[PDB]
């Protein structure tokens, strides 16, 4: 005899709530739009009706991305997750982005769902105030059996947001082997690792964590497809990815992509004592045909009438498509990077009263900080929404006085675990930089050239490790954000800077039509 | 017997009638500025007083270049050439940029001086017109003997200017020879050759001219020194040059810069036969320890007047020296062009209503167009005076659709006969291209990359022959200037675009404070 489990699952859907462009900026042309919370449930209830053993999982990061998020600060996950009937969610690093605060009031005491996470453990004042807002696992009901789900949340949380100094993040599979245990003594067969670390180390826990029989994880944007993918994104690998384990066990691991574009579909086949005998499926784009769900979309649109005084005034126009996509702004040069550099720049300039500062030419900015696409389509209209999507954080370009060594140090960090999509892939403006990635890390920096300051006429000359230079950056990399540590212990001196999305819409403003291109700032060698 | 002769000579003043910085930008700290007028005058003074036989002679080129002729278009040229009371002018190829009748009116009818053009023959119903207005030639009393001046232009004057089609320009050397022939049979012992025709030119005249004494050159902004020269023009060669003649002779060739930061100055020792025994000298820096005259000075306060009204709005900061001289901007990519490359870009996409060109990102700019530089260090303001003397002509910057091939043609163009500071050296925008010069002209571009425009995110691709490529441009590009033939032939489409001036006024009053760098979009290489 067998048991079938469907496990639906969505992670760093990243307040996607409407439907959005095929590249996950603001939706124009109706017709081609994807994704979003109303086209979700459609697709939810269709396999709800067919399917009798389904979970609706969530492996974090719901927390910041569009205006939704601005304006009503986790009440509209709390309230949309609550309409699709999502049975559990995990913490991800971006849930603790307004503090813990920001996650204890919106999210935690509204959610009629458990979420979860077994590696974060509460201290101090704060561990009576959130004990059982959140919880290690919980052991759902599903038909006449039950299915343990076990959360896990990134040991990086900290260096990426604003958990605070009482919540201790511990090592994954540490932290979830004596959940799992536990679970087995309590006669719970099986068991979802539900959480949000990376595919890398959801592999390490499908082959670690003995007793996990599925990974549902997130954080790494990962695709996953089997046979030929319906759109865009290349896939990693097959959907699912299966680890074999320690134990000799076939483990399948998930994820699916980003922004609410696909919706995950694992069928799992389970025999009497809670082994997986097979597993199959794949990510299913929500595209037009997909209808948004009636009900759940008059519902955004009553929750979207507070929204709309931010999609009203035209900043400016855009006659290129502003790429600030994850696939090219962690990878290369993209033309999103180099825009807000120059906006960065050209702002700082402005300020004649201040003459520290009134040379800086140069910038550094994590790819990872560039958060969406601007499309030129529509006679490529930039609103401050559009702005939003971008630059979601609420940071501040800051100017920072650096010695040359802590420069190169900065530039060897920024590739030195490349090809992963992590955001610490800097775009730059004023510096010309050439890396050569068949070398080892720390060594890969070939070509380093800066704008000189003492200079009637500025040049790229090549940067000296002894000589001493000015950079304009975000807040998050001079406080040392993106494992950017040579930069907080060896700067020598830091001001803070003016609002990152008021500094861009400005500049906008000011250019009117706005072309940015890709100039080669970043080469290969 | 001998007999001592002093030439006194400026070339390429280019309107800047008033003293100017270093660079020849305008004067902001007074203290370190040079040349002028007045300043001029003091030392061509100091020298008739302390020498019986001078001669002051100009080598052309004193029209454009500042607001000075843009306001009084020649008539400040007559006035204070006629004030300084110079003995004779050659005709340059800038003395035509008003048209035939933008010399006749102003200089030919108010100078009190010769001028001169031997290879100039006016024909059609023009030759009645501005018959004796300027001559071949002129025979000068200089106390007890004379001295014949003989004039010539450049040839390549029709492609640089607007001389109508009723002036031929001869072959100097050709047009010369008789000239001087009929001087000797004049009796004219002593015969300088005095034009508008570049430093290579002149050594050709030098050599190949029999019976010509000395040359008194211009066109090429050549400085000559002997010995440590006072400021930042590297010299070209000795002062004077010498060339040994065909039939045996040294033949002293001159130069002085340009702008009126120098005065010429060579002493000639003649027998009685009128051949050079000797010559020597150097050009004389008009800095701050030669005063300016009180006369002439009161008079340009006089003539400044009107002027004032082009230098009271501020339109904009600049934070970086905009690199706007001829050394940079005719051998290597400069800021300056940079700069109104990208002006010339941001502009055009205001025609939104337009839309052929509304996505225009390559520009092409020659840097003999770019004028002068403006200086930084006075708060570096930019007014409009400031702007008129780095885009002097009242052109407009052209929209034009090009092959490749055209392009690539353009570019080899470009470096064909690099390293003699001619104008056609092309500033870009939105084009990456890279020269080897150890290569043969017309194969020295290695590599040029351009902006895409059937793409969503531009980034620089490899330049195709056969695809097409819009391009803005000065209209002397459009229309053939600097020998840009394949440009004028091949082109596809040509639309009129705004005035150069305002495109770059407009830009600058955009963007308030500017800082434009040099960023490798020409670069050198030798494989
Ligand atoms: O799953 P994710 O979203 O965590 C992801 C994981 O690699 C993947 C992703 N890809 N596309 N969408 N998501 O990206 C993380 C990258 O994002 C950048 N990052 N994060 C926060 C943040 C920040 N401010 C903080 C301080 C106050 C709370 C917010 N400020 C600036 Cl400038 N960058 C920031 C950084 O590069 C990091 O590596
Ligand atoms: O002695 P010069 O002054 O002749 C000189 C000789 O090599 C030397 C020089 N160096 N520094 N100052 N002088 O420069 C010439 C270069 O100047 C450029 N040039 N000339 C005219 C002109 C023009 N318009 C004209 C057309 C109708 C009347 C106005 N328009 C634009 Cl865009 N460039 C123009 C061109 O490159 C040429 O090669
Ligand atoms: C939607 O996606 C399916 C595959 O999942 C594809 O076959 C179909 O063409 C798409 N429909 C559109 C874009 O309307
Ligand atoms: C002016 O020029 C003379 C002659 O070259 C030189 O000796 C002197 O130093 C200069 N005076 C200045 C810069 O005040
Ligand atoms: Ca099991
Ligand atoms: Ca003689
Ligand atoms: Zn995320
Ligand atoms: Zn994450
Ligand atoms: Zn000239
Ligand atoms: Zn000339």
Redesign the interface.
Known sequence: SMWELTILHTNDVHSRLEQTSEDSSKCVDASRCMGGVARLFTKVQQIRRAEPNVLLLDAGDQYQGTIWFTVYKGAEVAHFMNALRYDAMALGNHEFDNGVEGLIEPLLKEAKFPILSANIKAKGPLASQISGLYLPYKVLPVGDEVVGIVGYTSKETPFLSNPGTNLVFEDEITALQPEVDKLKTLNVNKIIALGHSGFEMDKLIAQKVRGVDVVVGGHSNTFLYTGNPPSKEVPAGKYPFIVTSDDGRKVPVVQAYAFGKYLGYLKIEFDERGNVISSHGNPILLNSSIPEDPSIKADINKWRIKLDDYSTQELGKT???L?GSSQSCRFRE??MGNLICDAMINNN??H?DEMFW??V?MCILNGGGIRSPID?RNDGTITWENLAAVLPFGGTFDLVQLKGSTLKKAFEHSVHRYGQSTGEFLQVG?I?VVYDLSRKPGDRVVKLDV?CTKC?????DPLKMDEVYKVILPNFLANGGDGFQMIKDELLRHDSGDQDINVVSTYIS????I?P????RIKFS
Do not use: Q
């Open positions: 006659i290129v498509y790429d993209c033309n300039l402005r004649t009134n040379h030419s030129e004023g010309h704008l009637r006429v500025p040049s790229y000011k250019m009117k039509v072309y291109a890709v100039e080669g």
